[PDB]
Amino acid sequence: STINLQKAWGAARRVSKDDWLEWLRRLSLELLKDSSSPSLRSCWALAQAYNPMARDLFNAAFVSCWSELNEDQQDELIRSIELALTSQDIAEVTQTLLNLAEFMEHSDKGPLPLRDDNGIVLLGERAAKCRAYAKALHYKELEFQKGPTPAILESLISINNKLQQPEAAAGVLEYAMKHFGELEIQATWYEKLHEWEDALVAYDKKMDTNKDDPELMLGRMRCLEALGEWGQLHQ
Amino acid sequence: VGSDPVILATAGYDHTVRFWQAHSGICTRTVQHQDSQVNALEVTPDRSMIAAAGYQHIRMYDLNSNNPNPIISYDGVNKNIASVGFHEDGRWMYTGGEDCTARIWDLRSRNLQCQRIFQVNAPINCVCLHPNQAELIVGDQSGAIHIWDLKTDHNEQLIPEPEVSITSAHIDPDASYMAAVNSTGNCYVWNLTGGIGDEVTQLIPKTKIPAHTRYALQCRFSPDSTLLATCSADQTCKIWRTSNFSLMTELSIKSGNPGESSRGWMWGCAFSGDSQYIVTASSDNLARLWCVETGEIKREYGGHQKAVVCLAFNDSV
Amino acid sequence: MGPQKALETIGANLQKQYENWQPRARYKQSLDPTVDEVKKLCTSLRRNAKEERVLFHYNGHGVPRPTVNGEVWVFNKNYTQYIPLSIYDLQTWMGSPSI
Amino acid sequence: LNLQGINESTIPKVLQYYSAATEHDRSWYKAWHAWAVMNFEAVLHYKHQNQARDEKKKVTEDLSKTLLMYTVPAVQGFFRSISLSRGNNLQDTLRVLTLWFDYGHWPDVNEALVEGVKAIQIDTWLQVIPQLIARIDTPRPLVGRLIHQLLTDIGRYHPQALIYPLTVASKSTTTARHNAANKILKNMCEHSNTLVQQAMMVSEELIRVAILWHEMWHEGLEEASRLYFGERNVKGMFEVLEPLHAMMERGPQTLKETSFNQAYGRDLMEAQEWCRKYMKSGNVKDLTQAWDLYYHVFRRISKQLPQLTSLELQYVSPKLLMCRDLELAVPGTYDPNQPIIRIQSIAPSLQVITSKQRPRKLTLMGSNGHEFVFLLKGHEDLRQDERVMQLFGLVNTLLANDPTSLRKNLSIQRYAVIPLSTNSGLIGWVPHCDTLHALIRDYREKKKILLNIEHRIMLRMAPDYDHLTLMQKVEVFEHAVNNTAGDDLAKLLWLKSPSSEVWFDRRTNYTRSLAVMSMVGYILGLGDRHPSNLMLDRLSGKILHIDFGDCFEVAMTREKFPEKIPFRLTRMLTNAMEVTGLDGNYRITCHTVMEVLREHKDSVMAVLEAFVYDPLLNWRLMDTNTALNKKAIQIINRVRDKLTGRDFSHDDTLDVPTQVELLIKQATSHENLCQCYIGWCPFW
Amino acid sequence: TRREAIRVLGLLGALDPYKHKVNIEMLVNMGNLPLDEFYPAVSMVALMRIFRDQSLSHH
Ligand SMILES: Nc1ncnc2c1ncn2[C@@H]1O[C@H](COP(=O)(O)OP(=O)(O)OP(=O)(O)O)[C@@H](O)[C@H]1O
Ligand SMILES: [Mg+2]
């Protein structure tokens, strides 16, 4: 009961939207046929016909199967899931596999071991393009728990902004101040937080040391139009 | 223990008080101490009996006779006797407690009640008898140092920094400098006026040494009065030279590895008879006889199961 | 009534009910009993009621159904396992004239 | 005022302005309110300057003339500033009461009040029915007559707003209260009668339900044994037991009381014979026979009490079982605007919560069809909680009005509190909640972690933990915190949510809700915030405090284990917030709240002053010592200190960010946390 | 049409979101149970979503 499954896992010769959606349907329905618990196996025949039935049992089908599989088969499966997230982003196919990954975290079966980091980095990047910014955030904080870096803090700030949460984003800048000092704080971070007064102070400090760089000129002008200092901006 | 010239007792949370040997590092005899921890040990100037201030009892064991229990177990005090001093005549004994009262105890008489009392606002962390045997310096949790005179009752209150518990304070045997230490980890040194007879005793503020990052715990000058040892929760016992107040040596008990959350704090410290060595107790269960100049563990005493908060050390001939 | 009191109460009521019919007899309750507990109970009642009749009332509503192998269920000391009790052993301990 | 201050030269000037302001805009709310409050401060400046100079013959007679010049204006002003709010006039209305109770015995102030009480709408007074009934029996006749007359007219329209608090007063122990309270009900009878008599029954029956005889004998014999065997106070021991013997001398009024009197009652009456033999003989052998009988029933009761998981109404109170379609409305539902949600019927079973106090879980069916669950507490006075919920209501209004707060949806979760006697009352049950202690217990049994792990680690390191010096404790305390990942609450908030977009919203609510009650609790002085006293809404994620006994820093002053903490902000609560830490939403919300409270400090003062100076509730403040009016000023001075940022050093005046910074340091400090009672769980 | 639908969102004027907030189970199933109970429960819930009027005509 894993010959037809291994074709549905390791096909991945799909170069369109409906091709990957076909990969999903074949994957989901193959999990129903296999599933050891007969309550799921009994929905197979229905699910072949009605497809939103197959989507609703996806996570439950998956877990039942994924517990039974033998390590090398788990790796065979996960490599194909990575390919679907990595190669070719479709709004339906990605958000199915993110909801699988999230469902797997809540289970005692433990999270999907994707790509060494439990795919914390992979799933975060993918959730950001799906515009699932709370999933994006959860993963980006797990990242931060393991080891804080400046690049993490930056993304953490922009995620909070996209998610309409500027006071939480402000807190990320306060963290930076204490634990990393000042050099790690870019001028752009103030700009993202709408700290136009403090961003201008930062771009002035930067433009003194460095020479006439196009990025730092526009960065400082961008602050002036936001402040509304039309006098200095026209100079 | 008593007949041997050097004494080195050690005690902490494990209900024992182990009498070591400085030359070897071997436990000669243990002594039971139930019902409490020990907050402060103290050998008497006469060297007949040790003291052990704990919780609601200053116990005092025999140094001469081998393997008994306590001789003179005082009681009648609530909440932790934090300190004990000793008068050089061997008659009087001073204390400081969490109940906000310093005291004086007659050793030669029977009175279980203390003789005199100098109540204060906040809990008393440390006592220190001035070498002239006339003034008793007293730190506390509010920040207030005091100088309760033993003849006129004129307490001269003093606060180095507002709202920081001064945890220890010592004054050297030659009455030159007085040091204090607080829970921020600073070490305020005060220069003394030569006022033994007149009782002028005016404290002139010299230096706030930024000694440690974390809680400081005890400071003590050497018998030479050239060195000022300063212990702390950051797992180091720094030694500052008295002339400059610049970091001479730093005795640390860290792991040498970032993956080690809290081995133990550095509690007590006590200079040798000639300021060549410096003994040091820690919460990693180990007393350590260090070398002052070099900064090297000459010996290590490994007896206790639970932590070690006190030391006593006496090379008095 | 809550678990423990209810069991004593049901035992008390059950005794009263029987005392309407036979008011002059030694009643002796066993309440969620062990096997040893039943042995000591029945063997004592046969000693007393030497050749005269003894009633054995068994109410097994809280234990699994009696088996094909001629067994009736009681508990272990801790109330963690249903212990079987053989009807053979039960009719050993109880005597001849009995109901 | 901001430049000069309050003094002899400013008051005549600032009144000159505000009087003019009032002239130029009659209708304008603030112009009258400012005039009124200024006059009201001109009273308290001249009252407190009299006590400062005169106390520490002619001056009290001058004070009559002096204050009455500023007292009559203040009243007239507050009455106009009520009629121009008509919706948000609590501050204004309480200030009128404070004036009336204190100074209303004067002829001129009395007149002003009479004219005022006529003009004002009767709906306004429903806010302050608690504060009124507290002074139902004021020894001054001229004041008390106008209270009665006002309450009477609140009875004639909105009787549902009055029956519950009057019925509590009507069965008061003190003679004047119950006389005054009954006299008012006699008037309410000829309006309603059925409503009065329904409420009179329901409340009597609910009290009977709240503490059964075997529960009273249990608490009484525990207290009576401590007096006799412990202290050797024999006359005081009879004061504990003689009401309990006299209690049963009514006889069995219900089946539960019959079955008590059946089993035990014969012995208790016999034990009283030995006690009454001791009073006229004086023998040790007589009185020891009684304690043999008392300890016989005491052990039998103690064995029973754990088995009462539920009480059936048929046994405990059949009167309540009978009740159908009562006109008397569901407790704490009454609103003068909404249609009355009257009691359809009371459910037959009472799910008794297994705690120290054994509260019931009463549930009433409304006429609207919805069930209303309550918690029927016995022997725990709820008049504080009633007042404290009045404060939270006010604070919620303030946060709704401020846009910053409104945009963030800041508010305090509150519940109904309905006292029934000095002992007992109903608390409104909040659904979808569970205590923080419960959550962590249930998470740790799931994840196989030892519940007392932090405690066990400490006692392993130092078995004398309780008796250690402060510094010693801090070491031990930190060693526990460094060697346990305090992430149980953060982790379980994730696990317990469905999506992550929901999780995110729950956590935002959580953080803000916490911050609001940290600040509000700080001001109120609210202590005893151990993890059983705060609960988390399992849908919204919002926090909810319960148990408001330890207010106004009473737990900071107490002798054994004084709290050294402004509010609970310990590492589990902090980890459950955003991973960046306190410095995001929590600290920012803390500012926003403390800005609102600091702005509207008169409104907050007005409410807190009301229930500190209430002489029914003052007993809580005196009891910390091992006269009251002195202690009551100190409390309210401190509240002003907190609300003005003059609370750490009276010399300095901190801005909100600086004050909120020092508070968070104080709550977070290890030195402070390690001193806490271990039951407080300073490590969660 | 798309142009007018913008031109009308224009004229009514950029409404602020806070004025707009006033103007307006499968994971939960697993959140509770062990897996052997869970599988029927999620199957049933999914079947009874179908088992209501519309899609049943054939199924
Ligand atoms: N307003 C409320 N809504 C819902 N549940 C509540 C409410 N207040 C308390 N509870 C629950 O009922 C339990 C018992 O109530 P409470 O803690 O008020 O009294 P207690 O534990 O008997 O007495 P104490 O806490 O004073 O020792 C609490 O642990 C809590 O879970
Ligand atoms: Mg409680």
Ligand SMILES: [Mg+2]
């Ligand atoms: Mg309570």
